[PDB]
Design a protein around this nucleic acid. Structure first.
Ligand SMILES: [Mg+2]
Ligand SMILES: [Mg+2]
Ligand SMILES: [Mg+2]
Ligand SMILES: [Mg+2]
Ligand SMILES: [Mg+2]
Ligand SMILES: [Mg+2]
Ligand SMILES: [Mg+2]
Ligand SMILES: [Mg+2]
Ligand SMILES: [Mg+2]
Ligand SMILES: [Mg+2]
Ligand SMILES: [Mg+2]
Ligand SMILES: [Mg+2]
Ligand SMILES: [Mg+2]
Ligand SMILES: [Mg+2]
Ligand SMILES: [Mg+2]
Ligand SMILES: [Mg+2]
Ligand SMILES: [Mg+2]
Ligand SMILES: [Mg+2]
Ligand SMILES: [Mg+2]
Ligand SMILES: [Mg+2]
Ligand SMILES: [Mg+2]
Ligand SMILES: [Mg+2]
Ligand SMILES: [Mg+2]
Ligand SMILES: [Mg+2]
Ligand SMILES: [Mg+2]
Ligand SMILES: [Mg+2]
Ligand SMILES: [Mg+2]
Ligand SMILES: [Mg+2]
Ligand SMILES: [Mg+2]
Ligand SMILES: [Mg+2]
Ligand SMILES: [Mg+2]
Ligand SMILES: [Mg+2]
Ligand SMILES: [Mg+2]
Ligand SMILES: [Mg+2]
Ligand SMILES: [Mg+2]
Ligand SMILES: [Mg+2]
Ligand SMILES: [Mg+2]
Ligand SMILES: [Mg+2]
Ligand SMILES: [Mg+2]
Ligand SMILES: [Mg+2]
Ligand SMILES: [Mg+2]
Ligand SMILES: [Mg+2]
Ligand SMILES: [Mg+2]
Ligand SMILES: [Mg+2]
Ligand SMILES: [Mg+2]
Ligand SMILES: [Mg+2]
Ligand SMILES: [Mg+2]
Ligand SMILES: [Mg+2]
Ligand SMILES: [Mg+2]
Ligand SMILES: [Mg+2]
Ligand SMILES: [Mg+2]
Ligand SMILES: [Mg+2]
Ligand SMILES: [Mg+2]
Ligand SMILES: [Mg+2]
Ligand SMILES: [Mg+2]
Ligand SMILES: [Mg+2]
Ligand SMILES: [Mg+2]
Ligand SMILES: [Mg+2]
Ligand SMILES: [Mg+2]
Ligand SMILES: [Mg+2]
Lengths: 58, 159, 185, 60, 61, 172
RNA sequence: GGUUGCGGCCAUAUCUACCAGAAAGCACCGUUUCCCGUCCGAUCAACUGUAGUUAAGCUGGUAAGAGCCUGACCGAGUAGUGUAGUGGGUGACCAUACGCGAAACUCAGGUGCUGCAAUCU
RNA sequence: GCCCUGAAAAUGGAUGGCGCUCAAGCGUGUUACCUAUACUCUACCGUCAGGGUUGAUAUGAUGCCCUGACGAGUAGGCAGG
RNA sequence: AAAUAUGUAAGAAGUCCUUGUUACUUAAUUGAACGUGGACAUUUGAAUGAAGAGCUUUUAGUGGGCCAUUUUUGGUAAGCAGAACUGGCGAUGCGGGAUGAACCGAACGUAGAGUUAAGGUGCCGGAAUACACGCUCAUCAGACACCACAAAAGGUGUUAG
RNA sequence: GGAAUACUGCCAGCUGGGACUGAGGACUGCGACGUAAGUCAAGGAUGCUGGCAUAAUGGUUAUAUGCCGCCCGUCUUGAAA
RNA sequence: GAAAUUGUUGAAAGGGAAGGGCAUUUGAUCAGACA
């Protein structure tokens, strides 16, 4: 009982029915995978200016 | 059976360029990458540690991370009918700053100019790129140039 | 023929009336299409829509979430509009005057509101008072706080609550969920 | 018409404003026996230049 | 007309500007068209036979 | 390919900064319309020079009318043709009134005797034979004997009705 | 311009054979008490800068030189190729139409450019 | 090139058949003409979309009105009946 | 070292300036990252198109496929076996190819009038026993793609070279 | 030397024959012709005349005639098999 | 007191099936609408 092994036939047909969905961009992407030594400090840095820009509104 | 290892099929792809084997020249290491930098990816075979996968050869991405001897490049790989996001950890030897954007970047600086050059003048700019236009009327002379007449040529052999 | 480029005969995919069968609702909707059609005020067509909204896309606005909104910069005299039921919140202690206009006030909500010298207004009275919705503040409730959306998007590494009946250990918290039992998510 | 034939500064807008023309089959036929060849090869497709008019009329 | 004559007069050749405008007519039916042309056909709004549109001629059209 | 016209075509390679005014070349081309004439021009030019239409420019296209179009003329013709097995140079002589006439029948003859379609033919030269006795083909010399006459034996009047009441007669 | 120390690009820098190199500098060169290393003070280590030399290194120049680099309608719009046809041909294959387009070849030109610092008739 | 030789199978039989030979054959040209559920104009049905209109003192507001584009269909979905 | 095919970029999430934050980093308020304050509008930065774009939930059937042109592997070969891209058949009638799942043409609401495709027009059969130049005579002529086959090799048949 | 003509193209030049269609239902628009009153071919057919007033037209049905039409259901890549 | 199926009567068609589609002739039958 041999049968068909594998084909790509008609697959792009299907991908194109509903997309190839352009990759979707975000301003402010994530820091995922960003070096932690950086990120540790970067946290404190923002905390800092946040505090400052609070004291700016006194 | 079949074979599909990490570097399979990559014979000529990771090969080294004719008469360009040996050390990687020292500029490859003096170059300086920042986040947001666009880089083109091309594996250097002599450098085994931190190679991209074959898929990402000739691919272009954006730096999202900078580490001691590496940059993290994010690529959009598309699978099925959609793109997913891939962070690649690459060594500085498989990466170069991309020229994919300097023409733009050159053009902006240039556009800002002849816009202020025009503003400070009397507006009148037109600075979108237009594509190749058809050429205009023109007159061709014969002073020094009469048309030579050619005909097709009989069949021959030389052998 | 035509090399079509877009599904032929597609329905807009938006409601056009409520699905509900309530006269009163059908009346409110009757009012507001008229307003929406002849006032060019954008506030009216927003409402006209929401009146078609299914109960899910109508989460309740709490009376505390109302008091917050009035704490906006320059908002405390606006009259909030809510195209859904409004409910009471034992957790605020100080509630303001204002004028809340809605589809339903729960007993407690209307209570509390009024105790503070406020006023509960039906959407049709809101109409006569503010035909272009002058001075209105439209609030929406939290759509995504539904228990159901907890389970939407279920899959590996998405951390999103099994569709599960009984829970506690012994209930899907072993192989696949920890590093020491095969693998984790 | 003018903005169209002179290809004016606003041709994109002008030309798009016009719905694609929907003309009939050439009245007295295509002049060729087989359509799907180049004009040069005695068939109907391709750039046939100033000869487009003779056609477009018959079909309009 | 007078440019062409004035040139012949002068022993020369007047080459007209290449055309800026063309007019396209879809000539083929609806089926068995390969993707890339078929996409372009659409882009030029020629999605049914014998319909037709004007096309401003640049390299990029 | 149809009923022929004859065109002078003129192209040149596009001008460069460092080579403005390229060289200008002419071809007499026998074609039916002149869209085909320009095509043919480019066909041959690329078979002679480094150009292609892309980097060249037609400068002029002009119809050449036969000079003495009611003068019976003996044409010698030179043609490069392509058969099935191989390719072949060939010389024919055609007697007619215009070169355009002549080229029309050449093509017919190459279709009939050699099954040569249009694509596979190259007119090399078509030129008027001045003095007879330089005419070289007996199927034409035949037609220059002095005081030449001939009957047209076995007449065939074409019937205009399905039936006839006569019985025909091919006298003439 | 020369030279040196650190370089970038990594043969227009390499290869072969000749020849020229002022001044400085590099060099070769002298020595074995000391640290140091060798079967061997040849390399490596120290010490002198004194006793010597342009021989080599090095730099440059010559060559119908090898190589390498650059150019060109030199070959070639060739080979190959995307598109088309109820084109040819028993076939093998081949023409034609709208496009893209090499490599060898041939001929010509060339033979390191250059950054920082110190130095020099 | 066309034609002929090369050229052998089983019920009687197939350029589709008749038949055609300056063809009703082969190559090539030029016109006219025939006719698809396709193209163009129009009517009508239905689907989808955009507008308009609660103003009584008459009858459907899920209505009434204007306008445009679209219509193949197994498995299968949904809708109105 | 091509052709086809393939990554990215073509701005407001933009380009500059002024000088805060930190525990990171520098010889160094050096840098890095995130900011504050300020300067420049649609020729705001190619084309064409856009009966709009984005997003979410749920569920059917299906998970034997087969064909054509091109690329292509095994096989002498196959109406054989297996891949690549696209187009189809499957699921689809209509006109053409006599006939035919897949070729050509063209994709279907009920109809009138017109024009056509592909293919035809002696008669069957709607439509020129039209026009034009050649070629061919077969005691086994020939007659339109897919397609329903013929080869080497020969002819002082005839044509043109 | 000086015309003609062919060919290709243009005219918001004039004009004949034939066929299908007549959706809509006060007005409302954009126009055209008039010195004007007014007229009109300008946001979809009217006028005039005749014949039958019934099986005349039309429906239904049987038959004949031209062309066309294989047995449904099913599994299947593929069934009239 | 249906259907399959049957007898009689009446009408019609039938050169190796019958039934079907578009169309019209012919026969039979019939609704309407007219004033
Ligand atoms: Mg099995
Ligand atoms: Mg099998
Ligand atoms: Mg399978
Ligand atoms: Mg393998
Ligand atoms: Mg596996
Ligand atoms: Mg080495
Ligand atoms: Mg390792
Ligand atoms: Mg909760
Ligand atoms: Mg006509
Ligand atoms: Mg005519
Ligand atoms: Mg006609
Ligand atoms: Mg034909
Ligand atoms: Mg017409
Ligand atoms: Mg366009
Ligand atoms: Mg002449
Ligand atoms: Mg010295
Ligand atoms: Mg010792
Ligand atoms: Mg020593
Ligand atoms: Mg030492
Ligand atoms: Mg020396
Ligand atoms: Mg040295
Ligand atoms: Mg040399
Ligand atoms: Mg090719
Ligand atoms: Mg072929
Ligand atoms: Mg070849
Ligand atoms: Mg036969
Ligand atoms: Mg026949
Ligand atoms: Mg013939
Ligand atoms: Mg005729
Ligand atoms: Mg129809
Ligand atoms: Mg349907
Ligand atoms: Mg559909
Ligand atoms: Mg691309
Ligand atoms: Mg658009
Ligand atoms: Mg839209
Ligand atoms: Mg599903
Ligand atoms: Mg499944
Ligand atoms: Mg199965
Ligand atoms: Mg196909
Ligand atoms: Mg199936
Ligand atoms: Mg089909
Ligand atoms: Mg057949
Ligand atoms: Mg095709
Ligand atoms: Mg017959
Ligand atoms: Mg007939
Ligand atoms: Mg063939
Ligand atoms: Mg032979
Ligand atoms: Mg012979
Ligand atoms: Mg009417
Ligand atoms: Mg009416
Ligand atoms: Mg009656
Ligand atoms: Mg009567
Ligand atoms: Mg019957
Ligand atoms: Mg039949
Ligand atoms: Mg079954
Ligand atoms: Mg089977
Ligand atoms: Mg069956
Ligand atoms: Mg009884
Ligand atoms: Mg009867
Ligand atoms: Mg009937």
């Amino acid at each position: 009982a041999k049968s068909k092994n594998h084909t790509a036939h008609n697959q792009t047909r299907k991908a194109h029915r509903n997309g190839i969905k352009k990759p979707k961009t975000y301003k402010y992407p994530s820091l995922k995978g960003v070096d932690p030594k950086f990120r540790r400090n970067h946290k404190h840095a923002l905390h800092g200016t946040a505090k400052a820009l609070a004291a700016a509104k006194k | 059976g079949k074979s599909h290892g990490y570097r399979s099929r990559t014979r000529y792809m990771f090969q080294r360029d004719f008469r360009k084997h040996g050390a990687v020249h020292l500029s490859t290491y003096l170059k300086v990458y920042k986040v947001g930098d666009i880089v083109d990816i091309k594996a250097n075979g002599s450098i085994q540690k931190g190679m991209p996968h074959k898929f990402y050869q000739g691919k272009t991405g954006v730096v999202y991370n900078v580490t001691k001897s590496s940059v993290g490049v994010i690529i959009n790989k598309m699978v099925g009918n959609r793109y997913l996001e891939k962070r690649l950890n690459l060594r500085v030897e498989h990466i170069k700053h991309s020229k994919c954007r300097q023409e733009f970047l050159e053009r902006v600086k240039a556009n800002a100019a002849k816009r202020a050059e025009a503003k400070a003048q009397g507006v009148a700019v037109q600075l979108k790129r237009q594509p190749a236009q058809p050429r205009e009327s023109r007159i061709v002379s014969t002073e020094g140039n009469v048309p030579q007449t050619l005909a097709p040529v009989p069949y021959e052999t030389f052998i | 023929g035509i090399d079509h480029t877009s599904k032929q005969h597609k329905r807009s995919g938006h409601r056009t009336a409520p699905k509900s069968d309530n006269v009163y609702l059908k009346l409110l909707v009757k009012l507001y299409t008229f307003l929406a059609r002849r006032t060019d005020a954008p506030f009216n067509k927003v409402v006209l829509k929401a009146l078609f909204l299914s109960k899910i896309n109508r989460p309740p606005v709490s009376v505390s979430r109302i008091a917050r909104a009035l704490k906006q910069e320059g908002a405390a005299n606006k009259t909030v509009v809510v195209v859904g039921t409004v409910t009471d919140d034992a957790r605020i202690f100080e509630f303001p005057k204002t004028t809340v206009a809605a589809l339903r006030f729960t007993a407690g909500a209307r209570a509390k509101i009024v105790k503070a010298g406020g006023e509960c207004i039906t959407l049709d009275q809101l109409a006569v008072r503010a035909p272009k919705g002058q001075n209105t503040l439209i609030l929406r409730g939290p759509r995504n706080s539904r228990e159901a959306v907890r389970h939407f998007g279920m899959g590996p590494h998405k951390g999103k609550a099994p569709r599960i009946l009984s829970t506690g250990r012994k209930f899907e918290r072993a192989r696949g969920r920890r590093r020491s039992k095969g693998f984790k998510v | 018409i003018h903005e169209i034939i002179t290809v004016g500064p606003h041709f994109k807008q002008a030309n798009n404003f016009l719905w694609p023309f929907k003309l009939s089959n050439p009245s007295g036929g295509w002049g060729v026996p087989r359509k799907f060849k180049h004009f040069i090869q005695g068939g109907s497709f391709g750039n046939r230049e100033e000869f487009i008019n003779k056609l477009v009329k018959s079909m309009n | 007309i007078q440019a062409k004559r004035d040139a012949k007069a002068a022993g020369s050749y007047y080459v007209e500007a290449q055309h800026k405008l063309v007019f396209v007519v879809r000539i083929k039916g609806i089926n068995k068209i390969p993707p890339k042309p078929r996409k372009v056909l659409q882009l030029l709004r020629l999605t049914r036979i014998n319909s037709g549109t004007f096309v401003k001629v640049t390299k990029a059209t | 390919m149809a009923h022929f016209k004859e065109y002078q075509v003129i192209g040149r390679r596009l001008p460069t900064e460092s080579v403005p005014e390229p060289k200008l070349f002419r071809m007499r081309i026998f074609a039916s319309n002149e869209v085909i004439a320009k095509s043919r021009y480019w066909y041959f030019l690329q078979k002679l020079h480094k150009v292609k239409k892309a980097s060249g420019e037609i400068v002029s296209i002009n119809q050449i009318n036969e000079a003495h179009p009611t003068k019976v003329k003996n044409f010698g013709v030179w043609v490069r043709y392509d058969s099935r097995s191989g390719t072949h140079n060939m010389y024919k002589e055609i007697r007619d009134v215009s070169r355009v006439a002549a080229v029309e029948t050449l093509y017919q003859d190459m279709a009939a005797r050699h099954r040569a379609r249009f694509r596979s033919i190259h007119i090399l030269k078509v030129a008027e034979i001045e003095k007879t006795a330089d005419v070289k083909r007996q199927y034409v010399k035949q037609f220059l004997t002095k005081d030449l006459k001939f009957p047209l034996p076995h007449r065939v009047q074409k019937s205009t009705k399905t039936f006839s009441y006569k019985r025909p007669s091919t006298f003439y």
